[PDB]
Amino acid sequence: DVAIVKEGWLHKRGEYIKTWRPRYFLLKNDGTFIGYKERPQDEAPLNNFSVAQCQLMKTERPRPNTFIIRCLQWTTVIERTFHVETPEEREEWTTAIQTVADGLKKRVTMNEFEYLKLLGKGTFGKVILVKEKATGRYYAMKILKKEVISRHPFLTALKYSFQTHDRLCFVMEYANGGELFFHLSRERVFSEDRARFYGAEIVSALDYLHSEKNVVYRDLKLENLMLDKDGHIKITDFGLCKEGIKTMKTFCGTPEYLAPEVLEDNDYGRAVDWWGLGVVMYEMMCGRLPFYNQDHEKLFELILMEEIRFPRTLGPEAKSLLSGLLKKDPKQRLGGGSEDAKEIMQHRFFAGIVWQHVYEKKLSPPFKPQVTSETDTRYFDEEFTA
Numbered sequence: 001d002v003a004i005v006k007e008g009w010l011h012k013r014g015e016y017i018k019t020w021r022p023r024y025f026l027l028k029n030d031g032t033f034i035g036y037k038e039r040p041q042d043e044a045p046l047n048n049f050s051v052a053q054c055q056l057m058k059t060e061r062p063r064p065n066t067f068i069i070r071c072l073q074w075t076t077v078i079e080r081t082f083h084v085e086t087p088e089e090r091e092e093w094t095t096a097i098q099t100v101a102d103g104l105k106k107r108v109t110m111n112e113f114e115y116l117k118l119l120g121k122g123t124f125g126k127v128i129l130v131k132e133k134a135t136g137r138y139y140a141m142k143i144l145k146k147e148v149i150s151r152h153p154f155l156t157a158l159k160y161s162f163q164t165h166d167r168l169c170f171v172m173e174y175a176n177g178g179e180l181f182f183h184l185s186r187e188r189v190f191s192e193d194r195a196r197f198y199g200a201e202i203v204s205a206l207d208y209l210h211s212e213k214n215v216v217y218r219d220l221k222l223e224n225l226m227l228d229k230d231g232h233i234k235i236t237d238f239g240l241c242k243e244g245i246k247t248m249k250t251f252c253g254t255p256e257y258l259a260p261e262v263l264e265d266n267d268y269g270r271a272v273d274w275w276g277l278g279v280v281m282y283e284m285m286c287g288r289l290p291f292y293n294q295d296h297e298k299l300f301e302l303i304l305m306e307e308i309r310f311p312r313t314l315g316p317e318a319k320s321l322l323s324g325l326l327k328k329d330p331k332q333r334l335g336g337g338s339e340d341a342k343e344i345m346q347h348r349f350f351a352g353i354v355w356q357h358v359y360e361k362k363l364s365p366p367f368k369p370q371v372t373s374e375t376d377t378r379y380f381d382e383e384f385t386a
């Protein structure tokens, strides 16, 4: 029953490098809107490219005949910007997309929290670290503009959702066991066993998002990993889409963790998260990023072309895992097949690991953060500078 509604060439604005790119897009009746570098000859649909519950806007800036697909995915507002040659083509696309979207459609207040610290600013709102006065718990509050608009042990849970007169607010649970980059920086390098533990929990969470939620996390990096009070991994959802910063070109964020297919603004899928897994687990066991340099052109080339290299102190099992995870071609990448996470869970690096015990947190955390409870503020104090 799934068929193509409309297909053709489009100019898509790059998601990390702001240049316009010629891409062949396929609009299907299941809601997927995917672009390709070349017209594909050609299973579960990813919600990352869904046009369901989205609003279309027609703009003449910064380029005439531009249309934008603005979507609210979970707790993050995203924008996909496209360009055509003639206004007639734009109307054809916007009508087709809207038609598909139509066919698919077939108390807690702000005074209850205390402002603590600005976590991040985005185009359509901000993220704030708050503390509930009643319980003393820590939370990350996503405060999004109103007019522009599920539990896993290793994912930051959405606690509350409320709105003001002009703002929509999402309340994330905030781990108090400390940032993982802080822990890795302090201890320089994690052992293979400890990295196996963190890695296993990450795999479990990614497996959940892929099979149950049918979504790609795409932001898997060290900065988005935290530990709770018990030392278990928490993958964070504190992000917001920003506008890039002007090396005369304009870039949005740092590219060191981005998958090659994501950098080239090509078709991407579940394999992206496995690349991220490779980057994270590489840094944990090697003590540094897989690809690093100052020039963005250089950094791109290292990610796109340069083969990953390993220290002599790294074991063959770890080398096999990282080599598979950091394959530049997602079709050849470990976990890039139809088996997805099972391809990684069955890898010999995770031999002996009982994955049911992983999800149920039966595995003893090798590291216990110096906190007494979920309200302990040690990783919020001056020590964080040390």
Ligand SMILES: *CCC(=O)Nc1cc(NC(=O)NC2CCN(Cc3ccc(-c4nc5cc[nH]c(=O)c5cc4-c4ccccc4)cc3)CC2)ccc1Cl
Binding pocket: 014, 015, 016, 073, 074, 075, 076, 078, 079, 080, 150, 151, 155, 156, 157, 209, 213, 215, 216, 217, 218, 219, 235, 236, 237, 239, 241, 242, 243, 244, 251, 252, 253
């Ligand atoms: C700076 C340049 C730039 O922004 N370019 C750019 C990017 C994009 N696209 C995006 O920004 N996409 C974002 C990628 C990261 N992704 C993170 C994410 C957070 C949360 C979830 C998530 N989703 C669901 C959905 C349904 N049910 C669920 O239970 C969940 C749970 C979670 C989740 C919760 C907690 C922890 C982890 C996951 C998925 C992904 C957000 C989108 C567009 C344009 C441009 Cl220019």
